[PDB]
């Protein structure tokens, strides 16, 4: 029952049109709570979940400045990778940064992680030990060299078991009412025949939290790893999630197939069938 | 909370 905070950063260029777009979003476990868009009217870091709103103007002042800081070391980097990669200055490009921290059930530091990408390609990532870096090509290999000099490895290690892990706890307490809840998936099955000799069994599940869930279609003990249709768990729009799985079944054998839902908020795996 | 001191470029 561990918890995590993740900060998602994305920078996309627009040659000529104007300064590139910077969308930064933050996620505590699986709930979004802060937001920053270079294009919104505010020009300031914004709240999204209610329990962070209680923090005062000082929190919004620092947080706006430090995220405006990251926006800028990234405009520069958009162009710098334009150079390293020998790419035209007429094309739009995407840098994606992701980093975050893990705390255990009891508040301890577990692990921290940073991963960066260019145009959807793995670029550099922070290693296991938090003391080394890994470059994906010889172009990022030059960045790896520079960070090894100004010691971005150790001063970022300081952050991931310090400033993040504290404020993660504070985030888990200022909203423990709403971040610690475990909502169980409300399960039911539906049936729609496709032809005479054929029919479809689809096992649905709504309103669960967190999104980790497992729907497994088992025919008399057998996994339909080669016969089942599963969709991406999707957000309902309200802080809970939805996911469904379906299997193609011969018309008249809807009892041989069984569905199993295994979730954190479900006491024991439910096995539902026709 | 966001990282406190943004560092070196790439």
């Amino acid at each position, epitope marked *: 029952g561990s918890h995590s905070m993740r900060y998602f950063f994305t920078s996309v260029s627009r040659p000529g049109r104007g300064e590139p777009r910077f969308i930064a979003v933050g996620y505590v476990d699986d709930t979004q709570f802060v937001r920053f868009d270079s294009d919104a009217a505010s020009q300031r870091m914004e709240p999204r979940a209610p329990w962070i709103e209680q923090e005062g103007p*000082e929190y919004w002042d620092q947080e706006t400045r*430090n995220v405006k800081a990251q926006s800028q*070391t990234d405009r*520069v980097d958009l*162009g710098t990778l334009r150079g390293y990669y020998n790419q035209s200055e007429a094309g739009s490009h995407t840098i994606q940064i992701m980093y975050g921290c893990d705390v255990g059930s009891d508040g301890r530091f577990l692990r921290g992680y940073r991963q960066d990408a260019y145009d959807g390609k793995d670029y550099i990532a922070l290693n296991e030990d938090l003391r080394s870096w890994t470059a994906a090509d010889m172009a990022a290999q030059i960045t790896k060299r520079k960070w090894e*000099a100004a010691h971005e490895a150790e001063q970022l290690r300081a952050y991931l078991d310090g400033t993040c892990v504290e404020w993660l706890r504070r985030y888990l307490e200022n909203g423990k009412e709403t971040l610690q809840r475990t909502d169980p998936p409300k399960t039911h099955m539906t049936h729609h025949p496709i032809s005479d000799h054929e029919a479809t069994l689809r096992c649905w599940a709504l309103g669960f939290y967190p999104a980790e869930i497992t729907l497994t279609w088992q025919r008399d003990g057998e996994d339909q790893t080669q016969d089942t249709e599963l969709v991406e768990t999707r957000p309902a729009g309200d802080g809970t999630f939805q996911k469904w799985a379906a299997v193609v079944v011969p018309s008249g054998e809807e009892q041989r197939y069984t569905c199993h839902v295994q979730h954190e908020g479900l006491p024991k795996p439910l096995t539902l069938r026709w | 909370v966001v990282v406190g*001191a*943004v*560092g*070196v470029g790439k």
Partner: T-cell receptor
Framework: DSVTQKEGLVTLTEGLPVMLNCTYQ???????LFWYVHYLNESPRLLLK?????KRTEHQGFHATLHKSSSSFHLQKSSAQLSDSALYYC???????????FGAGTRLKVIA | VTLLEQNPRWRLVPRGQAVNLRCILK??????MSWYQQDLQKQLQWLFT????????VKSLPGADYLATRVTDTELRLQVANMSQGRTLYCTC??????????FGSGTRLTVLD
């Protein structure tokens, strides 16, 4: 407000211990304080820094210790020498800010 | 021969005139550059911090108008206009945008006279 070095000018004989007063005002946890020294016909350079409560930091015979409790970071030296005569600026980084805030300067004029 | 290189080193300015200063970064891994002013009272004060090429901002203080531009990662420029009080201006860089040691250039002394 913010940083305040109340004593503007300090005059003592060489051999007397030296102390400069520096008080500060932040609303943030991110308290990083600096002493910078600026001689005449030189540039300002760093003398010492810390952000750690009650950690003595020393560098070149000068030392200061941060006391977050009293919003203080006083600069100390055991024995004044003719060579220390300078302008001294104390300055603080409020973490949230991109800028740095300096005091009005304390002139230590050691005489013989 | 140093980490920051600032020009011009000194400039006599008739009142109301302009002077352009520029600073050259000598080590790309301290990219956080800033301009500070020092007034005739010996007080130090921050002016701008700009990271990306293309950044321009203006600011007016007692005695001088400022226009700042980061040309590239290593060339930063500063225009002082409509002066009425002498100054010293310093260029700086540091490894992180705040909470790090701030490193000072040699400085440009400006004097207002006829």
């Amino acid at each position: 407000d913010s940083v305040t070095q109340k004593e503007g000018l300090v005059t003592l004989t060489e051999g007397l211990p030296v102390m400069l007063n520096c008080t500060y005002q932040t609303i943030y946890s991110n308290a990083f304080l600096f002493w910078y020294v600026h001689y005449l016909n030189e540039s300002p350079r760093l003398l010492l820094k810390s952000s750690t409560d009650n950690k003595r930091t020393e560098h070149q015979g000068f030392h200061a210790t941060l006391h977050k409790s009293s919003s203080s970071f006083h600069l100390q030296k055991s024995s004044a020498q003719l060579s220390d005569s300078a302008l001294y600026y104390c300055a603080l980084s409020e973490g949230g800010n991109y800028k740095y805030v300096f005091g009005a300067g304390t002139r230590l004029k050691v005489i013989a | 021969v140093t980490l920051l290189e600032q020009n011009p080193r000194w400039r006599l300015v008739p009142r109301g005139q302009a002077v352009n200063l520029r600073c050259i970064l000598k080590n790309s891994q301290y990219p956080w550059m800033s301009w500070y002013q020092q007034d005739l009272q010996k007080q130090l004060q921050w002016l701008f911090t700009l990271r990306s090429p293309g950044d321009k901002e203006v600011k007016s203080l007692p005695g001088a108008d400022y226009l700042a531009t980061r040309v590239t990662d290593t060339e930063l420029r500063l225009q002082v206009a409509n002066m009425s009080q002498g100054r010293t201006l310093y260029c700086t860089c540091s490894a992180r945008h705040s909470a790090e040691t701030l490193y000072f250039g040699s400085g440009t002394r400006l004097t207002v006279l006829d």
